[PDB]
RNA sequence: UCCGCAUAUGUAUAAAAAUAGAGGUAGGCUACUCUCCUGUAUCGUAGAAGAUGGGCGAUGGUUGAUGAAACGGAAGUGUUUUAUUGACUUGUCCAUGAAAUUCCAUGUGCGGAAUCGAAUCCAUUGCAUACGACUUUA
RNA sequence: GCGAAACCACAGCCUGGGGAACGGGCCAGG
RNA sequence: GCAGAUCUUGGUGGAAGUAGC
RNA sequence: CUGCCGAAGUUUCCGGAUAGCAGAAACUCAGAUCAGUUUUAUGAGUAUGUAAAAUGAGAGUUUCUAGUGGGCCAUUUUUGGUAAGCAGAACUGGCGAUGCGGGAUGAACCGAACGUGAGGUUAAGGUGCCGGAAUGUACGCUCAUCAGACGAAAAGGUGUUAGUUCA
RNA sequence: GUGUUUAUAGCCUUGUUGUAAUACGUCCACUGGGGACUGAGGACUGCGGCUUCGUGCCAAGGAUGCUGACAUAAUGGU
């Protein structure tokens, strides 16, 4: 089944936050394989999605997606800042996100 | 022991802008800094810290504080180039660099040949 | 990093002093502004020459003529501490005068918990004779047979699969 | 770098605090972590040092002695255990003494940022958690220190069988001309 | 000090393996396979020599290195000629039955060259014999008779 | 047992051991060489989500389905050995089909009954005892 | 069987600290 | 133009099916 | 209900007349003045003062007309001290009418003073985990069995690290 | 191991071989990409640049152009 997955695995770590104030509009995403802020420049502007399933079979489907884009790197270790169309729920801390390769400049 | 910080021992630079370039210690400034030089023109004579290099098993006899040109003469005389390359350590490094240069079409070709190689599966009963 | 500046200064000429004397010091500072301030402070406390009545006539950074040759530098320093009066002399082996002074500052700030303003250098000299070397550590570094293993090797990608070799 | 669903860590030679902080961050990152050989963890400091630390802890609570319970306590203090996120992250950690049968046949990784040989200065006294636990109440040290040889002997036999089996393909590799005919790609 | 090597001439012992900080210094008289885990000194088997490299060693490490050199010599001495430990016993007005018993008439019963490769163990055994012959609530002159090791020399 | 109702993306990787280093090494306890110097590796990876055929090379690698025997105790729950029965076989060479998606959007649960056991109450009992609740016996 | 009244800002497990009690109400823990 | 006035009037709670008769 | 302005919280005599702070009205006035500011030099005694330069701002008013007539944190200079702390003056600002980032938490400590938002960048603090951010680089000290991170203190250290002097 | 002076290595110093190169500092009204947020205003005027001149054109007093998906859905609110 290794003829698929055009995307890259990622994890939703947290929102942008200070010690005591959280900003849910921007989320901190750890793209796996990206290990520094210079490698995070490749994934800037790429589409990222959160894919989950819900009980109702609305649209005749069991899966729904929240889309987003990668805006800028966060820190030195390769984490990025992502803004989603809808703010990611706080329950999705440590959940998985998919980073496509489009819009591609390669 | 096989690797001693010594005058004339060949080292491999693993940190900095000269990563992956062979060099030979010419003097010991201190226990934390060593003076190295390489015959190739891309490597200027410089003082580097011991934490930025790894120590190779090749020892080639140099006088203390030898100049750059005489280092090159000794390097060519003792054929350090193609002596380091003969060891499997350099072959593994060279293969890693070559494998990193492969493009998508080359990667597809490698998968085809390695599948042609794997279908061999001949083992004596 | 530190830079070695030679600073020449003199007092403003007046009717009493048609032509004044030139006073030159070689002092280390990260930038020229620090060197000029240190030069005036040294002049004020050595020659009692005020900055208001004085002016800097020249300043030039000095590069090490032989940065590719190992050398031994002896530094005479003055320590200002709780007592405020100490004379010390240290010997450092390196390739440039700047590195030795930086090493001295790191050593004293670590061991003695000093500061840049308190520490003042009377002189830095190059020990060109092995017999002139006083410290035993530097004498070892000049022995004919430097032979020691690699120290402090210590060598994201967390969760390494195999145990490290951390050896030859 | 990359994550797996379950990560098995061989805690032999790993410092308690360094490994716990790495594990706690991985647990909050959304990963299931299994730490085996929890009795082989190391703590910087002499035997008497952490002895008085644990003896003072006994003076204070449910005093646990087992090495995994020591490690589980260290990881828990590095988690937001007062919230649902911290509790959920805690439940993804499985710390055990030794290597149980479900895990001795699975690959075990190590954390270089927590290894004693790469973090402690040579010549520094250290206290093993298993030895430290043995005198403070833990009574299963001897039986687990005896069973490990049985696991090691079986595992060593498996490695020899695997190595002997691998020799056939390794010889067959260079035997096939196509291995070197198109080896210009670095493979 | 950059280097503090301590060369020690190797004896005619059977084995001198010091792998994994375990100096299995075997010998003809005895196999003094004592692990060299006391000090972190690198041992170099330079033929008929044992260079105890103590490079970048501290004062405490150097003191341990010097003790290790004596231990190596002591192990070699035991591996070559052992260590005889002559023991002398003096009887008071009440002789001490020997399995120590009747110590000044003591009804309680406790438990002379002594050749041995392990000189430390032989000396420790001699101390145990001296510790066994311990006077309690008795004058020193009255308890002058006791078991004291006469001499200890290589057998 | 009947009746009614609601209807993760390759999930691939198993000696131990220390750095005052180990692993394994011919030979017959060695000797000495080799390897590291992380997995950027190894295993797998083609097919209108993976088609239909002609095949060919090898006459065999993957597996499904059963019939299986061994091993695995620490929490064995899995490691093989297979006997076959069928297939894909990317090992390789050809012929067809893919499209106007004509620029991204992706048996299981509940409520009822007819049943089979068991337990409590129960004949009970003080063994227990404000009452609960407990222990024996119908 | 009949049948009150007082009272009621509101919840309510402990160890320390929060300087003006801080506590029960905050912070750090069990 | 109300949330306060140990506010006024009316209605209704927890205490409580408690103290008790 | 919203918007705008906005104190004083204390000199002086002595419940007030005040003044002062904050507004309204009636003005005139840049070819003119004003200033919790720095100056030039000399006057007097580095400070202090002076008339006339730099910088900024347009300023001076006259009348009447609400509210207040305390303290706290203390700093600094400072007097007396007195086992020693401590107390007494002035000064300085802040809190008092002030939310916000940090300081584990915090009425007075470090930053910063506020319309509703988007993006960027910082301050003070920080980047092992809790916790956003380098288990960063380089050079040193220490192993504390009551480390360190925040008077029993004199000394003792066969506890040390570096150096200075005599040698 | 003792002393040597290029030996069958060379090291340092000195002037010196054709000049340099490089690093650092600084500047270009020199230039090539990647990402994100914003689109206020609403005829024409203006300042400019191209243009032989242009009811000319332009990145010049604030976004336009080309497409795709949906009414029994898409999108948001409670």
From Swiss-Prot, chain A:
GO annotation, cellular component aspect: cytosolic large ribosomal subunit; preribosome
Paired cysteines (S-S): none
A single MF term (Gene Ontology): structural constituent of ribosome
Keywords, sorted A to Z: Cytoplasm, Phosphoprotein, Ribonucleoprotein, Ribosomal protein
Xref: Pfam families: Ribosomal_L35Ae
BP-aspect Gene Ontology terms: cytoplasmic translation; ribosomal large subunit biogenesis
Described function: Component of the ribosome, a large ribonucleoprotein complex responsible for the synthesis of proteins in the cell. The small ribosomal subunit (SSU) binds messenger RNAs (mRNAs) and translates the encoded message by selecting cognate aminoacyl-transfer RNA (tRNA) molecules. The large subunit (LSU) contains the ribosomal catalytic site termed the peptidyl transferase center (PTC), which catalyzes the formation of peptide bonds, thereby polymerizing the amino acids delivered by tRNAs into a polypeptide chain.
Family designation: Belongs to the eukaryotic ribosomal protein eL33 family.
HAMAP family reported in the protein's UniProt record: Ribosomal_eL33
UniProt miscellaneous comment: There are 2 genes for eL33 in S.pombe.
Protein name: Large ribosomal subunit protein eL33B
Curated annotation (Swiss-Prot), chain B:
Localization (cell): Cytoplasm; Nucleus
GO CC terms in record: cytosol; cytosolic large ribosomal subunit; nucleus; preribosome
InterPro entries tied to this protein: KOW, Rib_uL2_dom2, Ribosomal_eL14, Ribosomal_eL14_dom, Translation_prot_SH3-like_sf
Gene Ontology biological process terms from the UniProt entry: cytoplasmic translation; ribosomal large subunit biogenesis
Keyword terms: Cytoplasm, Nucleus, Ribonucleoprotein, Ribosomal protein
GO MF terms held by the record: RNA binding; structural constituent of ribosome
Annotated Pfam families: KOW, Ribosomal_L14e
PANTHER family, A to Z: 60S RIBOSOMAL PROTEIN L14, LARGE RIBOSOMAL SUBUNIT PROTEIN EL14
Similarity comment text for this entry: Belongs to the eukaryotic ribosomal protein eL14 family.
Main function: Component of the ribosome, a large ribonucleoprotein complex responsible for the synthesis of proteins in the cell. The small ribosomal subunit (SSU) binds messenger RNAs (mRNAs) and translates the encoded message by selecting cognate aminoacyl-transfer RNA (tRNA) molecules. The large subunit (LSU) contains the ribosomal catalytic site termed the peptidyl transferase center (PTC), which catalyzes the formation of peptide bonds, thereby polymerizing the amino acids delivered by tRNAs into a polypeptide chain.
Official protein name in the record: Large ribosomal subunit protein eL14
Gene: rpl14
Curated annotation (Swiss-Prot), chain C:
Annotated transmembrane regions: none
Designated name of the protein: Large ribosomal subunit protein eL20A
Complex and partners: Component of the large ribosomal subunit (LSU). Mature yeast ribosomes consist of a small (40S) and a large (60S) subunit. The 40S small subunit contains 1 molecule of ribosomal RNA (18S rRNA) and at least 33 different proteins. The large 60S subunit contains 3 rRNA molecules (25S, 5.8S and 5S rRNA) and at least 46 different proteins. eL20 forms multiple interactions with RNA and proteins in the central protuberance, connecting components of core functional centers that are located far apart.
Comment field (misc): There are 2 genes for eL20 in S.pombe.
Cystine pairs: none
HAMAP family xref list: Ribosomal_eL20 (MF_00273)
First-listed, main subcellular location of the protein, grouped into a coarse class: cytoplasm
GO CC annotations, alphabetized: cytosol; cytosolic large ribosomal subunit; preribosome
Subcellular location as annotated: Cytoplasm
Function: Component of the ribosome, a large ribonucleoprotein complex responsible for the synthesis of proteins in the cell. The small ribosomal subunit (SSU) binds messenger RNAs (mRNAs) and translates the encoded message by selecting cognate aminoacyl-transfer RNA (tRNA) molecules. The large subunit (LSU) contains the ribosomal catalytic site termed the peptidyl transferase center (PTC), which catalyzes the formation of peptide bonds, thereby polymerizing the amino acids delivered by tRNAs into a polypeptide chain.
Gene: rpl2001
One annotated GO molecular function: structural constituent of ribosome
Curated annotation (Swiss-Prot), chain E:
One of the record's GO cellular component terms: nucleus
Compartments, record wording: Cytoplasm; Nucleus
Main location: cytoplasm
Keyword entries, A-Z: Cytoplasm, Nucleus, Ribonucleoprotein, Ribosomal protein
InterPro entries xref list: Ribosomal_uL6-like, Ribosomal_uL6-like_a/b-dom_sf, Ribosomal_uL6_a/b-dom, Ribosomal_uL6_CS2
GO BP term (any one): cytoplasmic translation
Keyword Cytoplasm part of the UniProt annotation: yes
Pfam family membership, one: Ribosomal_L6
Listed GO MF terms: rRNA binding; structural constituent of ribosome
Subunit note: Component of the large ribosomal subunit (LSU). Mature yeast ribosomes consist of a small (40S) and a large (60S) subunit. The 40S small subunit contains 1 molecule of ribosomal RNA (18S rRNA) and at least 33 different proteins. The large 60S subunit contains 3 rRNA molecules (25S, 5.8S and 5S rRNA) and at least 46 different proteins. uL6 lines the binding pocket for eukaryotic elongation factor 2 (eEF2).
Other noteworthy facts: There are 2 genes for uL6 in S.pombe.
Entries under PANTHER family matching the protein: 60S RIBOSOMAL PROTEIN L9, 60S/50S RIBOSOMAL PROTEIN L6/L9
Protein's name in the database: Large ribosomal subunit protein uL6A
Lineage of producing organism: Eukaryota, Fungi, Dikarya, Ascomycota, Taphrinomycotina
């Amino acid at each position: 089944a290794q003829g698929h997955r055009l995307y890259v695995k990622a994890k939703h770590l947290s929102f942008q936050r200070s010690k005591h104030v959280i900003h849910p509009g921007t989320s901190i995403v750890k793209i796996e394989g990206c290990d520094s802020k210079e490698e995070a420049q490749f994934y800037l502007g790429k589409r990222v999605c959160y894919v989950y399933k819900s009980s109702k079979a609305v649209r005749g489907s069991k899966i729904r997606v929240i889309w987003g884009t990668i805006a800028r790197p966060h820190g030195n270790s390769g984490a990025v800042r992502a803004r989603f169309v809808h703010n990611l729920p706080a329950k999705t801390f440590g959940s998985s996100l998919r980073v496509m390769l489009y819009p591609s400049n390669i | 022991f096989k690797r001693y910080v010594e005058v004339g021992r060949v080292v491999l630079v693993t940190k900095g802008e000269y990563t992956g370039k062979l060099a030979v210690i010419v003097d010991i400034v201190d226990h934390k800094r060593a003076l190295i030089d390489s015959p190739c023109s891309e490597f200027p004579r410089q003082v580097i810290r011991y934490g930025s290099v790894v120590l190779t098993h090749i020892v080639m006899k140099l006088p203390r504080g030898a100049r750059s040109g005489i280092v090159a003469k000794k390097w060519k005389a003792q054929d350090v180039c193609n002596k380091w390359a003969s060891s499997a350590w350099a072959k593994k490094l060279e293969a890693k660099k070559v494998r990193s240069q492969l493009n998508d079409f080359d990667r597809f070709a490698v998968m085809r040949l390695k599948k042609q190689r794997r279908e061999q599966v001949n083992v004596a009963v | 990093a530190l830079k070695e500046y030679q600073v020449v200064g003199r007092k403003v000429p007046t009717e009493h002093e048609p032509v004044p004397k030139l006073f030159r010091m070689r002092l280390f500072a990260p930038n020229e502004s620090v060197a000029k301030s240190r030069y005036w402070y040294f002049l004020k406390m050595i020659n009692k020459v005020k900055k208001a009545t004085g002016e800097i006539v020249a300043i030039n950074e000095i590069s090490e003529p032989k940065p590719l040759k190992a050398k031994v530098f002896g530094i005479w320093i003055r320590y200002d501490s709780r007592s405020g009066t100490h004379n010390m002399y240290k010997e450092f082996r390196d390739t440039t005068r700047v590195g030795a002074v930086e090493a001295m500052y790191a050593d004293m700030a670590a061991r003695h918990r000093a500061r840049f303003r308190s520490i003042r250098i009377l002189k830095v000299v190059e020990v060109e004779k092995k017999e002139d070397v006083r410290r035993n550590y530097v004498k070892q570094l000049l022995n004919p047979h430097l032979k020691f293993p690699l120290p402090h090797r210590r060598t994201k990608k967390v969760f390494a699969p195999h145990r490290p070799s951390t050896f030859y | 770098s990359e994550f797996q669903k379950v990560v098995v860590i061989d805690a032999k030679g790993h410092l308690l605090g360094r490994l716990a902080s790495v594990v706690a961050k991985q647990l909050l990152g959304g990963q299931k972590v299994v730490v085996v050989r929890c009795e082989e963890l190391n703590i910087s400091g002499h035997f008497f040092r952490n002895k008085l630390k644990y003896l003072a802890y006994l003076r204070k609570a449910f005093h646990f002695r087992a090495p995994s319970r020591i490690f589980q306590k260290a990881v828990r203090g590095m988690l937001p255990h007062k919230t649902a996120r911290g509790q959920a992250a805690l439940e993804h950690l499985q710390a055990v003494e030794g290597i149980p049968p479900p895990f001795d046949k699975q690959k075990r990784v190590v954390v270089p940022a927590a290894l004693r040989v790469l973090r402690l200065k040579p010549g520094r006294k250290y206290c093993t958690v298993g030895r430290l636990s043995s005198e403070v109440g833990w009574k299963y040290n001897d039986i687990v220190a005896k069973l490990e040889e049985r696991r090691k002997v079986k595992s060593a036999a498996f490695y020899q069988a695997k190595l002997a089996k691998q020799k056939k393909i390794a010889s067959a590799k260079e035997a096939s001309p196509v291995n070197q005919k198109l080896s210009q790609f670095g493979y | 000090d950059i280097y503090k090597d301590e060369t020690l001439t190797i004896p005619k012992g059977v084995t001198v393996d010091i792998k994994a900080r375990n100096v299995t210094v075997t010998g003809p008289r005895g196999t003094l396979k004592q692990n060299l885990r006391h000090v972190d000194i690198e041992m170099k088997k330079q033929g008929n020599t044992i260079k105890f490299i103590v490079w970048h060693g501290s004062r405490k490490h150097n003191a341990c290195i010097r003790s290790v050199y004596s231990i190596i010599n002591n192990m070699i001495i035991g591996v070559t000629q052992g260590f005889r430990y002559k023991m002398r016993l003096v009887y008071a007005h009440f002789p001490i039955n020997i399995e120590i018993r009747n110590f000044l008439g003591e009804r309680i019963t406790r438990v002379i060259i002594l050749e041995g490769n392990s000189l430390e163990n032989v000396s420790q055994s001699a101390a145990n014999i001296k510790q066994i012959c311990n006077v309690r609530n008795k004058d020193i002159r009255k308890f002058l008779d006791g078991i004291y090791v006469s001499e200890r020399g290589n057998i």
